[PDB]
Amino acid sequence: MDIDPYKEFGATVELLSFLPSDFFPSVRDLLDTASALYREALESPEHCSPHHTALRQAILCWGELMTLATWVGVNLEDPASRDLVVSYVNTNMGLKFRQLLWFHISCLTFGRETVIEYLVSFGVWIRTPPAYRPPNAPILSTLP
Amino acid sequence: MDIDPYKEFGATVELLSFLPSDFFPSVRDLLDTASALYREALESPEHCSPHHTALRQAILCWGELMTLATWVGVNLEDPASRDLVVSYVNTNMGLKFRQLLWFHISCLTFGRETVIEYLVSFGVWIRTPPAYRPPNAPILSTL
Amino acid sequence: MDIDPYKEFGATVELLSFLPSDFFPSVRDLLDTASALYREALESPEHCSPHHTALRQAILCWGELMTLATWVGVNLEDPASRDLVVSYVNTNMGLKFRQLLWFHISCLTFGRETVIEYLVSFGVWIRTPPAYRPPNAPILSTLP
Amino acid sequence: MDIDPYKEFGATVELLSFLPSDFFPSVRDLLDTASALYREALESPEHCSPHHTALRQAILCWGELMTLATWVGVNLEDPASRDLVVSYVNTNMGLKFRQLLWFHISCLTFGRETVIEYLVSFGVWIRTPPAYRPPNAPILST
Amino acid sequence: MDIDPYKEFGATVELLSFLPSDFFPSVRDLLDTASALYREALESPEHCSPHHTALRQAILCWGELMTLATWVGVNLEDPASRDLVVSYVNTNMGLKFRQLLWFHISCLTFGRETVIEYLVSFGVWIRTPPAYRPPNAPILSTL
Amino acid sequence: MDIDPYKEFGATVELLSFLPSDFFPSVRDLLDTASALYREALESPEHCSPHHTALRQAILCWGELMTLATWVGVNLEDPASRDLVVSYVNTNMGLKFRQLLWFHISCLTFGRETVIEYLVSFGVWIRTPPAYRPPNAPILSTL
Amino acid sequence: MDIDPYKEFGATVELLSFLPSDFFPSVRDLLDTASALYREALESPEHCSPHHTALRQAILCWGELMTLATWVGVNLEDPASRDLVVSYVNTNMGLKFRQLLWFHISCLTFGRETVIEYLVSFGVWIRTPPAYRPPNAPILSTL
Amino acid sequence: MDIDPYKEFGATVELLSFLPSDFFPSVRDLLDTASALYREALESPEHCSPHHTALRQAILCWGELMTLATWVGVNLEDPASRDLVVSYVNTNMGLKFRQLLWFHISCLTFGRETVIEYLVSFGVWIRTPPAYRPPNAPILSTLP
Amino acid sequence: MDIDPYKEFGATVELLSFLPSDFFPSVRDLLDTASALYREALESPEHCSPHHTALRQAILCWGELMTLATWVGVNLEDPASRDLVVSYVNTNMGLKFRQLLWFHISCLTFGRETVIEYLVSFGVWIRTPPAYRPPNAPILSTLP
Amino acid sequence: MDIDPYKEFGATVELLSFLPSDFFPSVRDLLDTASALYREALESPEHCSPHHTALRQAILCWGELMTLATWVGVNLEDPASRDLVVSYVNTNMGLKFRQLLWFHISCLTFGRETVIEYLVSFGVWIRTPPAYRPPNAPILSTL
Amino acid sequence: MDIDPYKEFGATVELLSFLPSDFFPSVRDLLDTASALYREALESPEHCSPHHTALRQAILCWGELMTLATWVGVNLEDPASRDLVVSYVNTNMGLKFRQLLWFHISCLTFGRETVIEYLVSFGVWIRTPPAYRPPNAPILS
Amino acid sequence: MDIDPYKEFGATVELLSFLPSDFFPSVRDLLDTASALYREALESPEHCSPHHTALRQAILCWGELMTLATWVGVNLEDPASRDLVVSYVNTNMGLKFRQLLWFHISCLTFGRETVIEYLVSFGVWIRTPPAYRPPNAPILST
């Protein structure tokens, strides 16, 4: 129905496309990052924030895919289809969840405006030719 | 972790399981109902309510599930595998998404308290023996 | 180019699609009701309401279509072609006029908000599985 | 030339045309209903209301119709022709008189606005296809 | 039961019986006069007068009788029965309609009291023996 | 039911018939003018004016007629029958729509009184002999 | 002397004839109801009500009729004449006394303004075709 | 069950039994007496008096008895039964109606207390031995 | 001594005869209802009500009758006489106790005036012919 | 299920059992006393006192017992069976009814406290040895 | 000795004995209704109300009954004795538990007074002979 | 629904598990103690206490098991299965009822807090090795 996941938060798919595909961390590291920082808030019966509301659904609909992978592992005695299904899952659908989890965790940790301006800064950094590219890339931190 | 989709809204998975599994409408037409009534709100760049965010996420991830089903049906070669994968997907991952869509659309249309009361009322009505239950099943209406 | 007959009033084609195709009455009954209830309204030189101009235009368009049907039935040499033309006319082009006449007549009789609420309620009713839907269906009436 | 009986009363011919032929009671029932409900008013000399003037003429004309029917039956020699004449005079022209008597009696008993709105609601109900209409028809009683 | 056609108009059946049966004009002439004088008032959607209210019903019932006659003449195949039925219809059933139409049209045109007095004045003239009966019968006129 | 399209706007069919049948422009040109001048108001969810509703209905009806013509040309098998049907359509059911579109578009562009007076002025100018009239026909302009 | 029973109470013979002839209860049941409900009032030396007076007179004359029937049954010899006399008595003179007793007892029990309206209501309900009337027949109740 | 027609008015059967059986006038004479004096009052829609109500009921039930007599005279095969039924009727059941009509008519005409006093006086007159009985019996009159 | 059980309360035997014999429930059900609703008031040393006073005596003399039945069962070696005795007891002496218990229990539960009105209404209901009798009979209840 | 006849009146079964069984009078004498002293109050439609209700109920159910005795004496065929039934009746069901009737009649005649004290006085007098007691037994008197 | 289960609640055993055996829903249905409507109150360490303690005790003892049933079924060797034992367990001890659960749940849902009057009305209805009783039963909802 | 029998009373199933399974007295002695001390309060129609409320239900649902055992022993014709069934009943289903009865009777008699402290003191006594365990086990007394 032409729904943009980040439009209600202020970004677009094109804006989030400034970062390369290899930039985003793994699903596992993001999940431990979430569970070590907002486990008591993603498990409480309150409308803490739309970021929390989106993170809950993202985690659940990723767990659905993990359960599907377990089911196709336990059934479908054809090894070729076994390998193809799981490979397609954790390669062509893990990227979207990585982007969503990274956005919703970085926003909650640092600031929506901070993340929004970091995206522009990183796009500017990555657009320049490598010869004139400065050695250090922009990074999100709260220390000097 | 351990997250309940309806706990932040006021319900639980067990409370939605009170109703029979063959009562909820089709996911094929629930999206049509949502698109014919809330498209302007769902495309808007604004937080309208906590219901809208969950509706958007559910619609998007179901669309991705349909994309996965299409990819399987296009790229796989074993008819048996193309049968089990699709059947599992749009039975097991379809029932709970039907429940989610019904809950959120009903909460947006009639009201959270009304839906919560209707759930309990229908659950109690169904279990009453037919010779004593009121003849007409409960229904949600706006008129 | 992208104009529908219901956006200016409050409804839409998809919203009006909640009712099944065969729900609407025939054309003769709708015309009889329109005449017997609002002839004086649709004879005066006044814009009583936007619901009246659309009714006038729809009635005139249906009259033109009926004149076309009479002409093709009278002045053609191929009975088969005559039959296909008339059948297509009163099978396909009559449904849209049925929907338009029903919408405008019901609005003028009961209220635009009442019609919208009835549409939503009937969509909810028809969406229910038959094993659980109540026997009686929603209807528009003023009696108790 | 196209005089209709209900325009002055606020209804129209096609508005009352939606009711089924079996919705109206018999003439022999509608006449006794009037005779038992409003008789002192129908015999009194004052114009009680415009609903009484339209009723007296209809009653007298139906009496004329019965007189014609019995005259035909008594003084026709062709049995088949007598059968068709009596059947026509008791079936085709009975429906209009039943409609008139029902309309006037129901108006006098229930008010005019109530009868008109009941007619509108009944038309709405009857135009609905049976697959979607509610099982029972709208009612008008006290 | 025993309803007087002329009682709400200050008259009675036997009072109107003073005039001979040949005095009343024909249905065609009476209907032409009505349609030429009060057509726009008879077709009005308002209660102009009880006279109009009665005239409308009388005209409609005469139309029904004409439809009956046409149906008999067309459908009925026996010429003798056809002729007998039509002769009876527009010989006997038309006289009362002629009286009613004449009464209501005259009361609409000249006046109820004028017609009431005219009936008595005509009775006086018709009772007189021919030797002393004036050769000019009473007439209705507006001068 | 004997309804006149222009009667609520202030004109009649006979008033628009005053001008010659060849004066009005083509349906394609009128639709292009409408699309290039009032699309943002014709596609708006508001009652801008009574002219806009009639314009919308006329455009939709013409689209339906064009769809009917396309269906006839696609499905009919007799070239002669296709010729008669299509030519009838865009020769006789087209002139009335040209008049309607011209009237409504000119009204929206210039004002109802200006368009109403222009009809009479142009007709009277055409009726007079050439030797006793201004040499150039009247024109509607905004400058 | 052309006297009506119910004309001093507010009804007529024709109005009571509106109801079916097989609706009124039996004479025995009516007498038992009267004896068990109003014996003290009927056996009192005071004008309790015109209903009481009429009830007393009707009961006394019905007792006289029963005494006549017993005398006929005792003294007559041929069975046929006794049969017709008795059957005529407790059919024809029984129906009207049933109507009288029902009217007076129902009045004394419920109210004249209620019994009068019940007659009209029941008659109109019975005349109505079954498919367009309430399914339950009207009944007089005290609770 | 044990109801008499005179207790509500002030008399009893025994008190009315002071007069001999052959004293009361005929049913016909009583009926013309009623019709010539209270015809307009016996047809009014008003409760003029309990006397009026009782007279109405008595007249109507005597009419029922007369109709029964006509029916038995018109439809019965046996002369013996035909004669016996009417002979019993207008001899045994007519006396009670004679007494009732006389009582009510005399009351309405003269006064209930006057009628009671007349009954009391006539008892004394009739019980006196014939030798000492005065020549003239008491009579109801309004003139001297 | 010509004593009526219900005269002191307001009803009469003929008035209580409106209900048929089959209407009243059994004796066991009435005793269970009494012992479940008013046991602590029937076993108390206070004049709570004349209804209680009558109920106590009725229950006691019914218990006496039951003791008589047990005694005649134990003795009276003749099975025929035993059978006639018990049959007479619990067929003809039980109906009166059923009526008494029903009357007193229904009065104590609902109200004396309500019971009287119900009796009158049920008499009216049962009097009418079956063809016109409404399908539902009057009943005593405190719920709609 | 455990109700005492005299508990509401202030006595017990064991208190009435204090007196000898042969002291109480006969049912016939007690009924004659009741009929000759309180018939006009026992026939009244009013609650005179709680004693009257108990007297009415006791008299009624004793009359029913006598009716049962008559029925068994009439219908039974074995003289021995009739003997046992009737003797059991008017001895065992008779003694307690004599006690009840005596208690209620004496109460109504003399006052509740007098009858209550008389029982104890008479019992203690009887249990006392003759040589150390008043020579004559106590008696209830109204003089 | 004689402890009436409902005496402390304003009710009485023969009062609840008039209801037919088909009036009460299944044990599974009643337990599901309880676990889906009052679970938060039934899991808390508070007392809440005297209507909760009896519900907890009944649920626990019924769980014991289920454990006994599955035990007998597993560790009984005679194929015939198990039939009678299990049928008795889920038929004769089922009715009393259904009565208790229905009483407590209906009280907690509708108020004690309403349920108390409904029992009297239903007893009056059920004691009427069929030839005179109304066609449909009195209703609590 | 995973309902703790002792949660509204400030206890826990694990906490009451400190006592050995042989510590609790027998059902007959516990019922005799209850009937000799709180009979007129358990048979009262009032909510004396939640302890009384629970004790009533415990007694009733034990009486149901006694009736079940009697029915089994009087109806089941197999003498091999009769033993097994009754032995299972009053060897396994009696222990939990004994624990419940002991807990509620002790809490009614001595006090909830006193019983709670006694449960901890008994555990402290029972954990001690035999060499240093005192020969006098803790007891409840007033």
Short mmCIF file of C-alpha atoms in Angstrom, two decimals, chain J residues 13-139:
data_model
loop_
_atom_site.label_atom_id
_atom_site.label_comp_id
_atom_site.label_asym_id
_atom_site.label_seq_id
_atom_site.Cartn_x
_atom_site.Cartn_y
_atom_site.Cartn_z
CA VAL J 13 -43.77 -30.84 73.40
CA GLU J 14 -42.02 -32.01 76.57
CA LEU J 15 -43.81 -29.31 78.58
CA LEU J 16 -47.25 -30.51 77.46
CA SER J 17 -46.13 -34.11 78.08
CA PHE J 18 -45.73 -33.15 81.75
CA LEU J 19 -49.45 -33.71 82.33
CA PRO J 20 -50.91 -37.23 82.27
CA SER J 21 -52.20 -38.56 78.96
CA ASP J 22 -55.71 -39.20 80.31
CA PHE J 23 -56.21 -35.66 81.65
CA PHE J 24 -57.10 -34.02 78.33
CA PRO J 25 -60.77 -33.97 77.24
CA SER J 26 -62.24 -35.56 74.12
CA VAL J 27 -62.12 -34.22 70.56
CA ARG J 28 -65.92 -34.04 70.47
CA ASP J 29 -66.12 -31.92 73.63
CA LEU J 30 -63.27 -29.66 72.52
CA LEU J 31 -64.87 -29.11 69.10
CA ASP J 32 -68.24 -28.37 70.70
CA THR J 33 -66.58 -25.84 73.01
CA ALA J 34 -64.82 -24.19 70.06
CA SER J 35 -68.01 -24.07 67.99
CA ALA J 36 -70.08 -22.66 70.86
CA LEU J 37 -67.51 -20.05 71.92
CA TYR J 38 -65.57 -18.78 68.88
CA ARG J 39 -67.43 -19.68 65.67
CA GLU J 40 -68.21 -16.05 64.78
CA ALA J 41 -64.48 -15.26 64.99
CA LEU J 42 -63.20 -18.45 63.32
CA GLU J 43 -65.50 -17.78 60.35
CA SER J 44 -64.33 -14.16 60.10
CA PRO J 45 -62.08 -13.12 57.16
CA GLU J 46 -59.54 -11.46 59.46
CA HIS J 47 -56.45 -12.39 61.48
CA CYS J 48 -57.86 -11.99 64.98
CA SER J 49 -54.76 -13.49 66.63
CA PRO J 50 -52.07 -16.11 65.92
CA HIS J 51 -54.10 -18.62 67.95
CA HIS J 52 -57.05 -18.45 65.54
CA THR J 53 -54.97 -19.44 62.50
CA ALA J 54 -53.55 -22.50 64.26
CA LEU J 55 -57.02 -23.45 65.50
CA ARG J 56 -58.40 -23.19 61.96
CA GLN J 57 -55.62 -25.31 60.46
CA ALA J 58 -55.85 -27.96 63.18
CA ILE J 59 -59.64 -28.21 62.82
CA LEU J 60 -59.37 -28.46 59.03
CA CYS J 61 -56.74 -31.19 58.97
CA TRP J 62 -58.53 -33.15 61.72
CA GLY J 63 -61.68 -32.97 59.61
CA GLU J 64 -59.66 -34.31 56.70
CA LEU J 65 -58.43 -37.16 58.92
CA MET J 66 -62.04 -37.97 59.85
CA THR J 67 -62.94 -37.94 56.15
CA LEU J 68 -60.10 -40.42 55.56
CA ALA J 69 -61.46 -42.62 58.36
CA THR J 70 -64.92 -42.56 56.78
CA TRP J 71 -63.47 -43.42 53.37
CA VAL J 72 -61.47 -46.39 54.66
CA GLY J 73 -64.43 -47.65 56.68
CA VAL J 74 -66.64 -47.45 53.59
CA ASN J 75 -64.26 -48.80 50.92
CA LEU J 76 -62.08 -51.37 52.70
CA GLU J 77 -63.34 -54.96 52.71
CA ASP J 78 -61.38 -56.63 55.53
CA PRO J 79 -62.96 -55.92 58.95
CA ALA J 80 -59.62 -56.47 60.70
CA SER J 81 -57.88 -54.01 58.36
CA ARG J 82 -60.61 -51.43 58.95
CA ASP J 83 -60.24 -51.99 62.70
CA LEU J 84 -56.49 -51.40 62.78
CA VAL J 85 -56.66 -48.37 60.48
CA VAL J 86 -59.46 -46.60 62.33
CA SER J 87 -58.20 -47.42 65.84
CA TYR J 88 -54.68 -46.26 64.98
CA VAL J 89 -56.19 -43.06 63.58
CA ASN J 90 -58.39 -41.96 66.47
CA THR J 91 -55.93 -43.04 69.13
CA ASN J 92 -52.44 -42.05 67.98
CA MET J 93 -53.39 -39.17 65.69
CA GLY J 94 -56.12 -38.28 68.19
CA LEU J 95 -54.16 -37.79 71.41
CA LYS J 96 -51.88 -35.10 69.96
CA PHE J 97 -54.82 -33.29 68.36
CA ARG J 98 -56.57 -33.32 71.74
CA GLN J 99 -53.46 -31.74 73.24
CA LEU J 100 -53.32 -29.09 70.49
CA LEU J 101 -57.01 -28.22 70.71
CA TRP J 102 -56.91 -28.04 74.51
CA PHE J 103 -53.86 -25.77 74.44
CA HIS J 104 -55.28 -23.35 71.88
CA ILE J 105 -58.82 -23.21 73.30
CA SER J 106 -57.58 -22.77 76.87
CA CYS J 107 -55.20 -20.04 75.72
CA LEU J 108 -57.95 -18.16 73.87
CA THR J 109 -60.24 -18.51 76.90
CA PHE J 110 -57.92 -17.64 79.79
CA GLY J 111 -54.73 -15.93 78.60
CA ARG J 112 -51.38 -17.39 77.58
CA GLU J 113 -49.57 -16.88 80.90
CA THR J 114 -52.33 -18.51 82.96
CA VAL J 115 -52.32 -21.63 80.79
CA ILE J 116 -48.51 -21.71 80.80
CA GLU J 117 -48.31 -21.56 84.62
CA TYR J 118 -51.17 -24.03 85.05
CA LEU J 119 -49.21 -26.80 83.30
CA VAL J 120 -46.27 -26.51 85.71
CA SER J 121 -48.55 -26.15 88.74
CA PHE J 122 -50.61 -29.23 87.84
CA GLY J 123 -47.52 -31.31 87.09
CA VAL J 124 -45.82 -30.42 90.37
CA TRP J 125 -49.08 -31.05 92.25
CA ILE J 126 -49.44 -34.51 90.69
CA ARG J 127 -45.82 -35.49 91.35
CA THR J 128 -46.12 -34.51 95.04
CA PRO J 129 -47.00 -37.33 97.46
CA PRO J 130 -50.64 -37.19 98.58
CA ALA J 131 -49.97 -36.73 102.31
CA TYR J 132 -48.09 -33.43 101.83
CA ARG J 133 -50.17 -31.69 99.14
CA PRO J 134 -53.43 -29.76 98.96
CA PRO J 135 -56.32 -32.24 98.85
CA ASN J 136 -57.94 -31.09 95.58
CA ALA J 137 -56.42 -30.79 92.11
CA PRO J 138 -56.10 -27.35 90.50
CA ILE J 139 -58.77 -26.17 88.06
#
